């Protein structure tokens, strides 16, 4: 089950993929709306993978241990430069969450892409599968791949004051190590913006 994804000049290859989960759409809707007056431009230099550390999954983590990451986070690269140098921005996300442990480990993680989420209760976690999601199960895979489009109230938004998407990782079943399992699993995220459009260039600092 070898899958190789290529964003910009960055590549990511996994040999234990269960496919790509497209969420809410398989393509992008119109980007040339009446709110930008035709001044939008595409920045293909920002469609690259950047790496962030989500958490450390251990036998301690019981069900309901939930970690959230609002995707337009602190980016030290071209994407952050666009955020600081443009008023309005638009993009979707291509998220690859890796929990590399061992095939002798047990338990299960649920990786979801929730729009407009700030906090979640334990009961609502039971329906977290309503969102574009995958399961990371160490017996069968160690990588979840989800693609979502731009999705918001407006066609373009100000990412300084609004985070449309949230990557959510929850522990469905506790990690079991037994004898031959990994003591802990470091859950990381590899995220790539897709179809980046900017409008309204800002003055210099």
């Amino acid at each position: 089950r070898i899958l190789t994804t290529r964003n910009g000049h960055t590549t990511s290859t996994t040999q234990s993929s269960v496919g790509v989960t497209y969420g809410y759409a398989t393509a992008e809707d119109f980007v040339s709306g009446p709110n930008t007056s035709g001044l939008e431009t595409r920045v293909v230099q920002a469609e690259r993978f950047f790496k962030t550390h989500l958490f450390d999954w251990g036998t301690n983590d019981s069900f309901g241990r939930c970690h959230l990451l609002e995707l337009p986070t602190d980016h030290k690269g071209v994407y952050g430069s666009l955020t600081d140098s443009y008023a309005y921005m638009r993009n979707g996300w291509d998220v690859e969450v890796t929990a590399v442990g061992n095939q002798f480990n047990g338990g299960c993680l649920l990786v979801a892409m929730v729009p407009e989420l700030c906090s979640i209760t334990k009961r609502e976690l039971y329906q977290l599968t309503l969102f574009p999601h995958q399961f990371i199960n160490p017996r069968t895979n160690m990588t979840a791949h989800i693609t979502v489009p731009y999705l918001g109230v407006n066609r373009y938004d100000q990412y300084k004051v609004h985070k449309p998407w949230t990557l959510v990782v929850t522990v469905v079943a506790p990690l079991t190590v037994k004898n031959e399992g990994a003591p802990q699993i470091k859950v990381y995220a590899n995220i790539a913006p897709t179809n980046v459009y900017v409008a309204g260039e800002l003055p210099s600092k």
Partner: antibody
Amino acid sequence: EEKVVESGGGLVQPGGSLRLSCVGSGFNFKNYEINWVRQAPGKALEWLAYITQTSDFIYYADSVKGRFTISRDNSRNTAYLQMNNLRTEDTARYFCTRAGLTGCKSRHCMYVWGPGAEVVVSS
Amino acid sequence: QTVIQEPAMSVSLGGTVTLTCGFISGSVTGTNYPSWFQQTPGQPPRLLIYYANSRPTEVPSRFSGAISGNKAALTITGAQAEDEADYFCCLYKTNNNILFGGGTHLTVL
């Protein structure tokens, strides 16, 4: 620099109550778990309490379960340890610890330690 | 309690020493997530080893962690004069029971 400071200690009659305050600077207090430990003069460290990022999971040591209460306020970048029914065995230096480090996003890290506040319980 | 450490150990300058951390009844594995701290008098402890083999970036390469003989081991190789301190052992055993060792006082001759 990532640092934490503890306040609210002192000398208190046994049977009383008091609240330790932990103030953290140099990091996002919302993204880190907080442990409260204590060290008796000339003795070994003893872990007391643990709270997660959003106060959803809270654990106490069996010696201080029910007696103590750990909470946090992320807006104020503070953590609180309210101690009630203090006994003479609790005279110690209390440390507020931030569990988290580059390459360590669990509770078994205990990286950042404060100078600790002294609590003296005697009659 | 239930955690056994050597009460005190001595190492020659530039030598190699191994501090050890066991249970009274049982084996220390990776599931216990052993951690090693160093403390000097009048100073808060600082983390040396986490996950029983990992060390922070700022910690020098002298300190190493391992799990050997069903016991957690902290090895100091080429000990300097700054290594004379009390070394503590944190072990995880269920969510609400975090154990600490007695503490080994290491002195450099």
